[PDB]
Amino acid sequence: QLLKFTLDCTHPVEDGIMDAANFEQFLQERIKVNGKAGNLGGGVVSLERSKSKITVTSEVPFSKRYLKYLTKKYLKKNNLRDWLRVVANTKESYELRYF
Amino acid sequence: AKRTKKVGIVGKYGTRYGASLRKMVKKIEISQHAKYTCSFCGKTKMKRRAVGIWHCGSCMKTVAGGAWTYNTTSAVTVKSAIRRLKELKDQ
Amino acid sequence: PRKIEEIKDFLLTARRKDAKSVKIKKNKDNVKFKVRCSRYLYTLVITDKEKAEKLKQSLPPGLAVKELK
RNA sequence: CGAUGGCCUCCGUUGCCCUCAGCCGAUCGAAAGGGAGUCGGGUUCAGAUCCCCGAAUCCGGAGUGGCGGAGAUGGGCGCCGCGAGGCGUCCAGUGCGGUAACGCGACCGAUCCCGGAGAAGCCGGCGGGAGCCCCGGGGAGAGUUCUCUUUUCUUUGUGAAGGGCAGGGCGCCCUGGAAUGGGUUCGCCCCGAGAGAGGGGCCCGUGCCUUGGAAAGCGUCGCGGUUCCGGCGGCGUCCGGUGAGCUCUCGCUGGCCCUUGAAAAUCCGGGGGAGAGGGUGUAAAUCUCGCGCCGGGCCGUACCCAUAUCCGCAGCAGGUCUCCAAGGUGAACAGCCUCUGGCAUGUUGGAACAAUGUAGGUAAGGGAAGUCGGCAAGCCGGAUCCGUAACUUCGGGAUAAGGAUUGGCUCUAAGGGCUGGCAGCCGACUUAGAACUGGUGCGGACCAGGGGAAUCCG
Ligand SMILES: [Mg+2]
Ligand SMILES: [Mg+2]
Ligand SMILES: [Mg+2]
Ligand SMILES: [Mg+2]
Ligand SMILES: [Mg+2]
Ligand SMILES: [Mg+2]
Ligand SMILES: [Mg+2]
Ligand SMILES: [Mg+2]
Ligand SMILES: [Mg+2]
Ligand SMILES: [Mg+2]
Ligand SMILES: [Mg+2]
Ligand SMILES: [Mg+2]
Ligand SMILES: [Mg+2]
Ligand SMILES: [Mg+2]
Ligand SMILES: [Mg+2]
Ligand SMILES: [Mg+2]
Ligand SMILES: [Zn+2]
């Protein structure tokens, strides 16, 4: 059993108001597994950085809506809420687009 | 346990209508609601449907009888006397 | 509506004078042949595919055929 | 019997005769009683079970009945033929299966007769099924993100009519014959007039699956007609669990009656057996079976249905019959707060805050001294645990009277299901006890009996 999800912040990084770095360590600190946010709860869940393509892999049950909630929290924290919006292209996917 | 010491079925009437009236209707209510033995099928299922109607639960036979009891003393004496008249008339 | 479960009586009802048109519905895992008669709509459901498109040319020539796209 | 038309066949149309036989009385009387049969999606400025689209259905009609299937096609004998199969004589054939409940696609039949459905009160308890509510997750979209929150909110489906299967009920049948009595309900109740135990049959199946049906609907993301579009595209419409929960409905069972709780239209079954069909076939009469053909006329249909469309002289605080009914607290359809939906304070606004009013409150000490009169106001008030007198028609009085407790938080104990004295896995609210703790405060708002002793009357 494999769970696989992707995040596409390509538009805002090519525009130049936010970068994928802060995004990635925001994930690897604040992802909690069985409620513990330390070190991704071990190697049970893996994070990978592509060219503005953030990939999350796991085998324990995971929530695409968890991922959406975390990216919304990032957008609010770094003040992009009124500019960006997180939607789903297809399954196992999210992408950030303007209004 | 014994719920009431001297009032029976008419305990449902509370403190109304008077003691003499209540104890007068007590026996009639007990007789009216009692279940009798069907003389036809032998079961104890002769229950009163209405005034003078006594229906058998399983036997499915209904009989005309008294208003509060299955039989009445007047009726049984009349039946016996009429039987005697019948046998005596033809010897 | 009436379901036809064996192959040949479907053609038997298809060739009746009453029949108006047959429409072919192609969803996943099923192929449905719906023939519209005066009283009922007769539906024949084929699970596989090869029976479906070797029957698709077995309908009478004079009967209208409509593929649901 | 007499005449006509249609290939004057067979039937129809009459006119006359024979024969057959009740009416509960013409007729009216219900837009809540009885009363066959239509549902889903879309559409308007205003109409939709009525329009369009798609699926149905009831009733009525049809010379030749339009058609299939049933009635139906077998047996005997003499034969032919190796047989298969085919000839010539007789005889039957208004269906068949199951021990039974009864079943099968139909399975002739008149006057007449019998029966059923229509067609039945109020209340109680319990169980089944839906709708709603609730809990744990997957999605999709939104809200908060000063800190926290795998977070909070919305949404997440299938008609009628067929077919099948669950699931309910049976006062239905067969075997067998039971005390050491047994089965069983919340209660009952049941049994040699046949219980338990097996095996069946029937009815309702509004639930599930399927045909309808994804093609439509809906939720999102994106392209179009720059518009006039049932526009076109992608994805999704998922998996579970529980409840003395509420409403509706079905069913079982009981209680109450000096109360026994509609009629007719209409429809159906049965008993009978008057009649009809053919002489072995091209079978016939006849079919409540399947499909096919035609039609369903007349009238109402907008809107309000009420602190503004009705009646009160009026946009009048009055009156006027009904259905639907979320979350929290709580016994509760009580009161209070909120969601869907709705509204703009009830035929005016602004500024002041005098008297007197109207409607709410609070008062030191006293506590009915006020007054005709405790009028009014005030006291009590829920629940749990104790306790409860005189008198009595023995049922009551009674929540008599009189006491104690009540918050928050952290625990403990007890009360169950499913699978394979035990083990594992799930679970719904309760009840009791304990510790700690707060400025003695805890039915903290709301809801919510003052009490006792006597006389008169009924
Ligand atoms: Mg009338
Ligand atoms: Mg009527
Ligand atoms: Mg038995
Ligand atoms: Mg679709
Ligand atoms: Mg209307
Ligand atoms: Mg005001
Ligand atoms: Mg105003
Ligand atoms: Mg007004
Ligand atoms: Mg006013
Ligand atoms: Mg004072
Ligand atoms: Mg004081
Ligand atoms: Mg004075
Ligand atoms: Mg007073
Ligand atoms: Mg007293
Ligand atoms: Mg006296
Ligand atoms: Mg009085
Ligand atoms: Zn009897």
JSON list of C-alpha atoms (C1' of nucleotides) in Angstrom, two decimals, chain D residues 253-412:
[
{"chain": "D", "resi": 253, "resn": "U", "atom": "C1'", "xyz": [-50.99, -8.70, 21.61]},
{"chain": "D", "resi": 254, "resn": "G", "atom": "C1'", "xyz": [-54.00, -6.97, 25.52]},
{"chain": "D", "resi": 255, "resn": "G", "atom": "C1'", "xyz": [-57.45, -3.61, 28.15]},
{"chain": "D", "resi": 256, "resn": "C", "atom": "C1'", "xyz": [-62.75, -0.59, 28.34]},
{"chain": "D", "resi": 257, "resn": "C", "atom": "C1'", "xyz": [-67.90, -0.42, 27.37]},
{"chain": "D", "resi": 258, "resn": "C", "atom": "C1'", "xyz": [-75.83, -1.02, 30.85]},
{"chain": "D", "resi": 259, "resn": "U", "atom": "C1'", "xyz": [-70.88, 2.95, 24.66]},
{"chain": "D", "resi": 260, "resn": "U", "atom": "C1'", "xyz": [-69.84, -2.72, 20.53]},
{"chain": "D", "resi": 261, "resn": "G", "atom": "C1'", "xyz": [-68.06, 1.80, 17.38]},
{"chain": "D", "resi": 262, "resn": "A", "atom": "C1'", "xyz": [-71.97, 3.35, 8.81]},
{"chain": "D", "resi": 263, "resn": "A", "atom": "C1'", "xyz": [-74.45, 2.43, 4.12]},
{"chain": "D", "resi": 264, "resn": "A", "atom": "C1'", "xyz": [-74.40, 2.00, -1.07]},
{"chain": "D", "resi": 265, "resn": "A", "atom": "C1'", "xyz": [-72.00, 2.21, -5.77]},
{"chain": "D", "resi": 266, "resn": "U", "atom": "C1'", "xyz": [-68.41, -1.20, -7.72]},
{"chain": "D", "resi": 267, "resn": "C", "atom": "C1'", "xyz": [-65.52, -5.73, -8.01]},
{"chain": "D", "resi": 268, "resn": "C", "atom": "C1'", "xyz": [-64.32, -10.88, -7.13]},
{"chain": "D", "resi": 269, "resn": "G", "atom": "C1'", "xyz": [-64.52, -16.22, -5.75]},
{"chain": "D", "resi": 270, "resn": "G", "atom": "C1'", "xyz": [-67.32, -20.51, -5.19]},
{"chain": "D", "resi": 271, "resn": "G", "atom": "C1'", "xyz": [-71.78, -24.46, -5.65]},
{"chain": "D", "resi": 272, "resn": "G", "atom": "C1'", "xyz": [-74.36, -26.08, -9.55]},
{"chain": "D", "resi": 273, "resn": "G", "atom": "C1'", "xyz": [-74.52, -27.87, -14.49]},
{"chain": "D", "resi": 274, "resn": "A", "atom": "C1'", "xyz": [-78.76, -25.78, -18.60]},
{"chain": "D", "resi": 275, "resn": "G", "atom": "C1'", "xyz": [-75.82, -25.36, -23.24]},
{"chain": "D", "resi": 276, "resn": "A", "atom": "C1'", "xyz": [-71.77, -25.45, -27.12]},
{"chain": "D", "resi": 277, "resn": "G", "atom": "C1'", "xyz": [-67.18, -28.56, -30.35]},
{"chain": "D", "resi": 278, "resn": "G", "atom": "C1'", "xyz": [-64.96, -32.30, -33.49]},
{"chain": "D", "resi": 279, "resn": "G", "atom": "C1'", "xyz": [-64.61, -36.92, -35.17]},
{"chain": "D", "resi": 280, "resn": "U", "atom": "C1'", "xyz": [-58.80, -37.58, -35.67]},
{"chain": "D", "resi": 281, "resn": "G", "atom": "C1'", "xyz": [-58.12, -32.78, -38.35]},
{"chain": "D", "resi": 282, "resn": "U", "atom": "C1'", "xyz": [-56.21, -27.08, -42.10]},
{"chain": "D", "resi": 283, "resn": "A", "atom": "C1'", "xyz": [-58.94, -30.08, -35.59]},
{"chain": "D", "resi": 284, "resn": "A", "atom": "C1'", "xyz": [-63.36, -26.98, -33.57]},
{"chain": "D", "resi": 285, "resn": "A", "atom": "C1'", "xyz": [-66.01, -24.28, -29.60]},
{"chain": "D", "resi": 286, "resn": "U", "atom": "C1'", "xyz": [-63.61, -21.51, -25.99]},
{"chain": "D", "resi": 287, "resn": "C", "atom": "C1'", "xyz": [-59.21, -18.64, -23.45]},
{"chain": "D", "resi": 288, "resn": "U", "atom": "C1'", "xyz": [-59.00, -13.88, -16.52]},
{"chain": "D", "resi": 289, "resn": "C", "atom": "C1'", "xyz": [-51.75, -15.99, -20.93]},
{"chain": "D", "resi": 290, "resn": "G", "atom": "C1'", "xyz": [-47.86, -12.73, -24.08]},
{"chain": "D", "resi": 291, "resn": "C", "atom": "C1'", "xyz": [-47.50, -9.06, -27.60]},
{"chain": "D", "resi": 292, "resn": "G", "atom": "C1'", "xyz": [-50.01, -5.74, -31.10]},
{"chain": "D", "resi": 293, "resn": "C", "atom": "C1'", "xyz": [-54.31, -1.58, -32.86]},
{"chain": "D", "resi": 294, "resn": "C", "atom": "C1'", "xyz": [-57.72, 2.84, -31.53]},
{"chain": "D", "resi": 295, "resn": "G", "atom": "C1'", "xyz": [-59.86, 6.41, -27.83]},
{"chain": "D", "resi": 296, "resn": "G", "atom": "C1'", "xyz": [-60.63, 8.77, -23.10]},
{"chain": "D", "resi": 297, "resn": "G", "atom": "C1'", "xyz": [-65.41, 14.18, -23.91]},
{"chain": "D", "resi": 298, "resn": "C", "atom": "C1'", "xyz": [-67.21, 18.52, -19.95]},
{"chain": "D", "resi": 299, "resn": "C", "atom": "C1'", "xyz": [-65.92, 21.91, -15.48]},
{"chain": "D", "resi": 300, "resn": "G", "atom": "C1'", "xyz": [-62.07, 23.95, -11.60]},
{"chain": "D", "resi": 301, "resn": "U", "atom": "C1'", "xyz": [-56.54, 24.96, -11.77]},
{"chain": "D", "resi": 302, "resn": "A", "atom": "C1'", "xyz": [-53.27, 32.30, -11.19]},
{"chain": "D", "resi": 303, "resn": "C", "atom": "C1'", "xyz": [-52.55, 34.51, -6.07]},
{"chain": "D", "resi": 304, "resn": "C", "atom": "C1'", "xyz": [-53.55, 35.52, -0.32]},
{"chain": "D", "resi": 305, "resn": "C", "atom": "C1'", "xyz": [-54.83, 31.78, 3.27]},
{"chain": "D", "resi": 306, "resn": "A", "atom": "C1'", "xyz": [-53.37, 36.34, 7.83]},
{"chain": "D", "resi": 307, "resn": "U", "atom": "C1'", "xyz": [-50.31, 41.35, 13.44]},
{"chain": "D", "resi": 308, "resn": "A", "atom": "C1'", "xyz": [-51.91, 44.02, 5.09]},
{"chain": "D", "resi": 309, "resn": "U", "atom": "C1'", "xyz": [-55.52, 39.98, -0.21]},
{"chain": "D", "resi": 310, "resn": "C", "atom": "C1'", "xyz": [-61.11, 36.46, 4.63]},
{"chain": "D", "resi": 311, "resn": "C", "atom": "C1'", "xyz": [-65.16, 38.51, 8.71]},
{"chain": "D", "resi": 312, "resn": "G", "atom": "C1'", "xyz": [-65.21, 42.66, 12.24]},
{"chain": "D", "resi": 313, "resn": "C", "atom": "C1'", "xyz": [-67.31, 50.31, 8.47]},
{"chain": "D", "resi": 314, "resn": "A", "atom": "C1'", "xyz": [-60.14, 50.04, 8.21]},
{"chain": "D", "resi": 315, "resn": "G", "atom": "C1'", "xyz": [-53.44, 47.66, 6.30]},
{"chain": "D", "resi": 316, "resn": "C", "atom": "C1'", "xyz": [-58.36, 46.90, 13.45]},
{"chain": "D", "resi": 317, "resn": "A", "atom": "C1'", "xyz": [-53.41, 43.78, 19.57]},
{"chain": "D", "resi": 318, "resn": "G", "atom": "C1'", "xyz": [-60.13, 40.37, 18.08]},
{"chain": "D", "resi": 319, "resn": "G", "atom": "C1'", "xyz": [-61.90, 35.84, 15.35]},
{"chain": "D", "resi": 320, "resn": "U", "atom": "C1'", "xyz": [-61.06, 32.02, 11.42]},
{"chain": "D", "resi": 321, "resn": "C", "atom": "C1'", "xyz": [-60.15, 24.39, 9.83]},
{"chain": "D", "resi": 322, "resn": "U", "atom": "C1'", "xyz": [-55.34, 21.75, 8.62]},
{"chain": "D", "resi": 323, "resn": "C", "atom": "C1'", "xyz": [-49.95, 19.06, 6.91]},
{"chain": "D", "resi": 324, "resn": "C", "atom": "C1'", "xyz": [-44.33, 19.44, 7.28]},
{"chain": "D", "resi": 325, "resn": "A", "atom": "C1'", "xyz": [-40.92, 20.39, 12.20]},
{"chain": "D", "resi": 326, "resn": "A", "atom": "C1'", "xyz": [-33.13, 20.81, 12.86]},
{"chain": "D", "resi": 327, "resn": "G", "atom": "C1'", "xyz": [-28.77, 21.56, 16.94]},
{"chain": "D", "resi": 328, "resn": "G", "atom": "C1'", "xyz": [-27.70, 22.55, 22.53]},
{"chain": "D", "resi": 329, "resn": "U", "atom": "C1'", "xyz": [-29.54, 22.48, 27.62]},
{"chain": "D", "resi": 330, "resn": "G", "atom": "C1'", "xyz": [-33.17, 19.91, 29.75]},
{"chain": "D", "resi": 331, "resn": "A", "atom": "C1'", "xyz": [-38.12, 14.62, 31.88]},
{"chain": "D", "resi": 332, "resn": "A", "atom": "C1'", "xyz": [-40.08, 17.40, 27.94]},
{"chain": "D", "resi": 333, "resn": "C", "atom": "C1'", "xyz": [-43.47, 19.52, 21.20]},
{"chain": "D", "resi": 334, "resn": "A", "atom": "C1'", "xyz": [-41.62, 23.59, 28.71]},
{"chain": "D", "resi": 335, "resn": "G", "atom": "C1'", "xyz": [-38.49, 28.13, 29.00]},
{"chain": "D", "resi": 336, "resn": "C", "atom": "C1'", "xyz": [-33.59, 30.29, 26.88]},
{"chain": "D", "resi": 337, "resn": "C", "atom": "C1'", "xyz": [-29.70, 30.41, 22.71]},
{"chain": "D", "resi": 338, "resn": "U", "atom": "C1'", "xyz": [-28.54, 29.00, 17.60]},
{"chain": "D", "resi": 339, "resn": "C", "atom": "C1'", "xyz": [-28.81, 26.74, 11.93]},
{"chain": "D", "resi": 340, "resn": "U", "atom": "C1'", "xyz": [-32.22, 26.48, 7.00]},
{"chain": "D", "resi": 341, "resn": "G", "atom": "C1'", "xyz": [-35.98, 30.12, 5.78]},
{"chain": "D", "resi": 342, "resn": "G", "atom": "C1'", "xyz": [-37.91, 34.98, 6.92]},
{"chain": "D", "resi": 343, "resn": "C", "atom": "C1'", "xyz": [-38.26, 39.94, 8.92]},
{"chain": "D", "resi": 344, "resn": "A", "atom": "C1'", "xyz": [-37.11, 45.68, 9.83]},
{"chain": "D", "resi": 345, "resn": "U", "atom": "C1'", "xyz": [-39.94, 46.59, 15.55]},
{"chain": "D", "resi": 346, "resn": "G", "atom": "C1'", "xyz": [-45.72, 46.66, 13.77]},
{"chain": "D", "resi": 347, "resn": "U", "atom": "C1'", "xyz": [-49.92, 53.66, 10.65]},
{"chain": "D", "resi": 348, "resn": "U", "atom": "C1'", "xyz": [-43.96, 58.57, 12.09]},
{"chain": "D", "resi": 349, "resn": "G", "atom": "C1'", "xyz": [-38.83, 60.59, 13.55]},
{"chain": "D", "resi": 350, "resn": "G", "atom": "C1'", "xyz": [-35.28, 64.09, 16.43]},
{"chain": "D", "resi": 351, "resn": "A", "atom": "C1'", "xyz": [-33.84, 66.44, 21.41]},
{"chain": "D", "resi": 352, "resn": "A", "atom": "C1'", "xyz": [-34.36, 66.34, 26.36]},
{"chain": "D", "resi": 353, "resn": "C", "atom": "C1'", "xyz": [-34.89, 62.76, 31.23]},
{"chain": "D", "resi": 354, "resn": "A", "atom": "C1'", "xyz": [-39.73, 67.76, 35.32]},
{"chain": "D", "resi": 355, "resn": "A", "atom": "C1'", "xyz": [-44.24, 66.42, 37.96]},
{"chain": "D", "resi": 356, "resn": "U", "atom": "C1'", "xyz": [-48.15, 62.67, 37.65]},
{"chain": "D", "resi": 357, "resn": "G", "atom": "C1'", "xyz": [-48.79, 57.98, 35.36]},
{"chain": "D", "resi": 358, "resn": "U", "atom": "C1'", "xyz": [-48.23, 52.65, 33.08]},
{"chain": "D", "resi": 359, "resn": "A", "atom": "C1'", "xyz": [-44.77, 48.20, 33.54]},
{"chain": "D", "resi": 360, "resn": "G", "atom": "C1'", "xyz": [-40.59, 46.32, 36.16]},
{"chain": "D", "resi": 361, "resn": "G", "atom": "C1'", "xyz": [-36.91, 46.26, 40.63]},
{"chain": "D", "resi": 362, "resn": "U", "atom": "C1'", "xyz": [-34.26, 47.11, 45.54]},
{"chain": "D", "resi": 363, "resn": "A", "atom": "C1'", "xyz": [-34.61, 48.80, 50.39]},
{"chain": "D", "resi": 364, "resn": "A", "atom": "C1'", "xyz": [-31.88, 49.86, 57.33]},
{"chain": "D", "resi": 365, "resn": "G", "atom": "C1'", "xyz": [-34.85, 48.18, 61.92]},
{"chain": "D", "resi": 366, "resn": "G", "atom": "C1'", "xyz": [-39.75, 46.24, 62.81]},
{"chain": "D", "resi": 367, "resn": "G", "atom": "C1'", "xyz": [-42.86, 42.27, 60.46]},
{"chain": "D", "resi": 368, "resn": "A", "atom": "C1'", "xyz": [-49.94, 42.91, 58.98]},
{"chain": "D", "resi": 369, "resn": "A", "atom": "C1'", "xyz": [-49.22, 47.55, 63.78]},
{"chain": "D", "resi": 370, "resn": "G", "atom": "C1'", "xyz": [-52.07, 48.76, 57.09]},
{"chain": "D", "resi": 371, "resn": "U", "atom": "C1'", "xyz": [-56.94, 47.26, 55.26]},
{"chain": "D", "resi": 372, "resn": "C", "atom": "C1'", "xyz": [-63.84, 45.55, 55.53]},
{"chain": "D", "resi": 373, "resn": "G", "atom": "C1'", "xyz": [-60.59, 41.67, 54.35]},
{"chain": "D", "resi": 374, "resn": "G", "atom": "C1'", "xyz": [-52.52, 39.57, 54.01]},
{"chain": "D", "resi": 375, "resn": "C", "atom": "C1'", "xyz": [-55.87, 42.90, 48.22]},
{"chain": "D", "resi": 376, "resn": "A", "atom": "C1'", "xyz": [-51.02, 43.12, 45.97]},
{"chain": "D", "resi": 377, "resn": "A", "atom": "C1'", "xyz": [-46.42, 41.60, 46.46]},
{"chain": "D", "resi": 378, "resn": "G", "atom": "C1'", "xyz": [-43.40, 38.35, 48.82]},
{"chain": "D", "resi": 379, "resn": "C", "atom": "C1'", "xyz": [-41.87, 33.03, 50.92]},
{"chain": "D", "resi": 380, "resn": "C", "atom": "C1'", "xyz": [-41.67, 27.65, 48.88]},
{"chain": "D", "resi": 381, "resn": "G", "atom": "C1'", "xyz": [-40.40, 25.47, 44.45]},
{"chain": "D", "resi": 382, "resn": "G", "atom": "C1'", "xyz": [-36.38, 20.53, 40.42]},
{"chain": "D", "resi": 383, "resn": "A", "atom": "C1'", "xyz": [-34.02, 16.07, 41.66]},
{"chain": "D", "resi": 384, "resn": "U", "atom": "C1'", "xyz": [-31.60, 12.30, 45.26]},
{"chain": "D", "resi": 385, "resn": "C", "atom": "C1'", "xyz": [-31.49, 10.20, 50.27]},
{"chain": "D", "resi": 386, "resn": "C", "atom": "C1'", "xyz": [-34.31, 10.04, 55.25]},
{"chain": "D", "resi": 387, "resn": "G", "atom": "C1'", "xyz": [-39.08, 11.03, 57.56]},
{"chain": "D", "resi": 388, "resn": "U", "atom": "C1'", "xyz": [-44.31, 11.71, 57.31]},
{"chain": "D", "resi": 389, "resn": "A", "atom": "C1'", "xyz": [-49.75, 12.94, 62.09]},
{"chain": "D", "resi": 390, "resn": "A", "atom": "C1'", "xyz": [-55.20, 13.51, 63.14]},
{"chain": "D", "resi": 391, "resn": "C", "atom": "C1'", "xyz": [-58.90, 11.45, 60.40]},
{"chain": "D", "resi": 392, "resn": "U", "atom": "C1'", "xyz": [-60.69, 7.86, 56.81]},
{"chain": "D", "resi": 393, "resn": "U", "atom": "C1'", "xyz": [-65.73, 5.41, 52.70]},
{"chain": "D", "resi": 394, "resn": "C", "atom": "C1'", "xyz": [-59.14, 1.78, 54.25]},
{"chain": "D", "resi": 395, "resn": "G", "atom": "C1'", "xyz": [-58.72, 3.53, 48.32]},
{"chain": "D", "resi": 396, "resn": "G", "atom": "C1'", "xyz": [-56.43, 8.06, 50.63]},
{"chain": "D", "resi": 397, "resn": "G", "atom": "C1'", "xyz": [-54.66, 12.24, 53.48]},
{"chain": "D", "resi": 398, "resn": "A", "atom": "C1'", "xyz": [-49.23, 12.75, 50.93]},
{"chain": "D", "resi": 399, "resn": "U", "atom": "C1'", "xyz": [-44.92, 16.38, 47.33]},
{"chain": "D", "resi": 400, "resn": "A", "atom": "C1'", "xyz": [-48.56, 15.92, 54.54]},
{"chain": "D", "resi": 401, "resn": "A", "atom": "C1'", "xyz": [-45.52, 18.34, 58.07]},
{"chain": "D", "resi": 402, "resn": "G", "atom": "C1'", "xyz": [-40.04, 18.29, 58.94]},
{"chain": "D", "resi": 403, "resn": "G", "atom": "C1'", "xyz": [-34.57, 17.47, 57.57]},
{"chain": "D", "resi": 404, "resn": "A", "atom": "C1'", "xyz": [-29.72, 16.75, 54.65]},
{"chain": "D", "resi": 405, "resn": "U", "atom": "C1'", "xyz": [-27.24, 17.02, 49.71]},
{"chain": "D", "resi": 406, "resn": "U", "atom": "C1'", "xyz": [-26.51, 19.39, 44.89]},
{"chain": "D", "resi": 407, "resn": "G", "atom": "C1'", "xyz": [-20.52, 22.99, 41.38]},
{"chain": "D", "resi": 408, "resn": "G", "atom": "C1'", "xyz": [-15.71, 21.82, 38.88]},
{"chain": "D", "resi": 409, "resn": "C", "atom": "C1'", "xyz": [-11.95, 18.23, 38.08]},
{"chain": "D", "resi": 410, "resn": "U", "atom": "C1'", "xyz": [-9.34, 13.30, 38.51]},
{"chain": "D", "resi": 411, "resn": "C", "atom": "C1'", "xyz": [-10.56, 8.31, 39.34]},
{"chain": "D", "resi": 412, "resn": "U", "atom": "C1'", "xyz": [-12.75, 3.44, 40.81]}
]
